[PDB]
């Protein structure tokens, strides 16, 4: 057990760490923001995303 | 002279440092642990160390 106290230097103070672990998979997309969906074209070249 | 004091942050606190310096030489081995010596074979292929 560590035993950190609030009156010492930063070398013995607790820091909450969120280890973001992820992987780019074959699965359908889940979490990629509120970004605007656009229209669809079937004959013209576009910069699709 | 630094003049260190025990009531300041870690940026101004003395740290004892042991600089390990070594080199892999032709000389016979000296310091490589209590690891178990094994038997010897003269006709069979092995993974020697």
Swiss-Prot record, chains A, B:
Changing residue 26 to P: Increased resistance to human covalescent sera neutralization. Residues 26-48 are annotated as: Disordered. Binds to host ACE2. RBD also interacts with the N-linked glycan on 'Asn-90' of ACE2. Cleavage of S generates a polybasic C-terminal sequence on S1 that binds to host Neuropilin-1 (NRP1) and Neuropilin-2 (NRP2) receptors. Interacts with host integrin alpha-5/beta-1 (ITGA5:ITGB1) and with ACE2 in complex with integrin alpha-5/beta-1 (ITGA5:ITGB1). May interact via cytoplasmic c-terminus with M protein. May interact (via N-terminus) with host bilirubin and biliverdin, thereby preventing antibody binding to the SARS-CoV-2 spike NTD via an allosteric mechanism. Attaches the virion to the cell membrane by interacting with host receptor, initiating the infection. The major receptor is host ACE2. When S2/S2' has been cleaved, binding to the receptor triggers direct fusion at the cell membrane. When S2/S2' has not been cleaved, binding to the receptor results in internalization of the virus by endocytosis using host TFRC and GRM2 and leading to fusion of the virion membrane with the host endosomal membrane. Alternatively, may use NRP1/NRP2 and integrin as entry receptors. This is Spike protein S1. It comes from Severe acute respiratory syndrome coronavirus 2. The chain holds residues 494 to 542 of 1273 of the full protein.
């Amino acid at each position: 057990s560590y035993g950190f106290r609030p009156t010492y230097g930063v070398g013995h103070q607790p820091y909450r760490v969120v280890v973001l672990s992820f992987e780019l998979l074959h699965a359908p997309a889940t979490v990629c923001g509120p970004k605007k969906s656009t229209n669809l074209v079937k004959n013209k070249c576009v910069n699709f995303n």
